[PDB]
Design an enzyme around this catalytic site. Structure first.
Site, PDB file in Angstrom:
ATOM      1  N   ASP A 163       0.794  -1.007  -0.018  1.00 57.89           N
ATOM      2  CA  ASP A 163       0.087   0.111   0.207  1.00 57.89           C
ATOM      3  C   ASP A 163       0.913   1.109  -0.005  1.00 57.89           C
ATOM      4  O   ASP A 163       0.778   1.837   1.110  1.00 57.89           O
ATOM      5  CB  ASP A 163      -0.976  -0.048   1.127  1.00 57.89           C
ATOM      6  CG  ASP A 163      -1.852   1.287   1.144  1.00 57.89           C
ATOM      7  OD1 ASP A 163      -2.618   1.656   2.136  1.00 57.89           O
ATOM      8  OD2 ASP A 163      -2.008   2.013   0.054  1.00 57.89           O
ATOM      9  N   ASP A 181       3.036   3.728   7.695  1.00 61.14           N
ATOM     10  CA  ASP A 181       1.970   2.724   7.906  1.00 61.14           C
ATOM     11  C   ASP A 181       1.993   1.519   7.299  1.00 61.14           C
ATOM     12  O   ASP A 181       1.494   1.156   6.215  1.00 61.14           O
ATOM     13  CB  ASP A 181       0.922   3.327   6.996  1.00 61.14           C
ATOM     14  CG  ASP A 181       0.169   4.371   7.822  1.00 61.14           C
ATOM     15  OD1 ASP A 181      -0.026   4.289   9.019  1.00 61.14           O
ATOM     16  OD2 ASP A 181       0.010   5.513   7.100  1.00 61.14           O
TER      17      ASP A 181
END
Length: 305
Positions: A163, A181
């Site tokens: 991602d 993240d």
């Protein structure tokens, strides 16, 4: 997920050495709050460090816990690099799971970019102009370079950031790019590619054709994402494939559809976007090459004749 969590003396920090502060954001996957860790440095246990703590909410689910744990273990393997949010420690024993990572005082790249004024000269005509605080071609190019330099590291560590987007890129007080993240990221050691489930939890507008249609992830799939990130950086927070809904994107992609060159974007950099979005994954550049090319682009943008 209902299992004993190991004890890692290397990263374990006394729960009484973390002074929690105000929250920095909330998501369905977890909650991040600012804080200060005492004595992260063994040479000086009296030194305070400003950190960001990742935790779950009272409404967290089993998955939310596995993600938070996955992000912890994953950041231990990847190691540390100047272009990624490094793990500083965690609180696992007796109590809630606390993942302590570096603090980015300037938020994510998306927000960071939409907050400032575009590079274009035309914006000087506007009543409210701030030349001292207006992004320039060099700034944008440098951001892409730093993220690329960061992804090049993850790849060498045989790690995939399934991602990669402006959302998962933080900016420090020194305007340094740091990929963050992790959690959906997976290891490639001893494997050719990572197999995703039937329906993943990754944004479709950032997924590669082979991953989105064949459930296949490779360092080349991260490159495709990088291509979409470039689009964001040169649109200053723009949203991929404008106006087209996720439902209709699946078809367009098969027909070879691609985004158009953003305004205030040099052809040199747009070709790189189309290069990353090559139908065939092997035909796409490698983070190794990208850092090289982007490095040369920075050198030129810095000295444009």
């Amino acid at each position: 997920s209902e299992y004993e969590l190991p004890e890692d003396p290397r990263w374990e920090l006394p729960r009484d050495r973390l002074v929690l502060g105000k929250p920095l954001g909330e998501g369905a996957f977890g909650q991040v709050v600012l804080a200060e860790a005492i004595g992260l440095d063994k040479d000086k246990p009296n030194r305070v460090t400003k950190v960001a703590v990742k935790m779950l909410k009272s409404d967290a689910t089993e998955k939310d816990l596995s993600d938070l744990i996955s992000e912890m273990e994953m950041m231990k393997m990847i190691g540390k690099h100047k272009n990624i949010i490094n793990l500083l420690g965690a609180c696992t024993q007796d109590g809630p799971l606390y993942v302590i990572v570096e603090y980015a005082s300037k938020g994510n790249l998306r927000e960071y970019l939409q907050a400032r004024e575009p590079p274009g000269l035309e914006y000087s005509y506007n009543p409210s102009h701030n030349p001292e605080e207006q992004l320039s071609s060099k700034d944008l190019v440098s951001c892409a370079y730093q993220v690329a330099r960061g992804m090049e590291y993850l790849a060498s560590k045989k790690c995939i950031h399934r991602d990669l987007a402006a959302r998962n890129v933080l900016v420090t007080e020194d305007n340094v790019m740091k990929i963050a993240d992790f959690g959906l990221a997976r290891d490639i050691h001893h494997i050719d590619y990572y197999k995703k489930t039937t329906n993943g939890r990754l944004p479709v507008k950032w997924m590669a054709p082979e991953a989105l249609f064949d459930r296949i992830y490779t360092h080349q799939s991260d490159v495709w994402s990088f291509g979409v990130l470039l689009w964001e950086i040169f649109t200053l927070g723009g949203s991929p494939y404008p106006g087209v809904p996720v439902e209709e994107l699946f078809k367009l992609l098969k027909e070879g559809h691609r985004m158009d060159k953003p305004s205030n974007c040099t052809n040199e950099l747009y070709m790189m976007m189309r290069d990353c979005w090559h139908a065939v994954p092997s035909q796409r550049p490698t983070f190794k090459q990208l850092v090289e090319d982007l490095d040369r682009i920075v050198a030129l943008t810095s000295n444009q004749e």
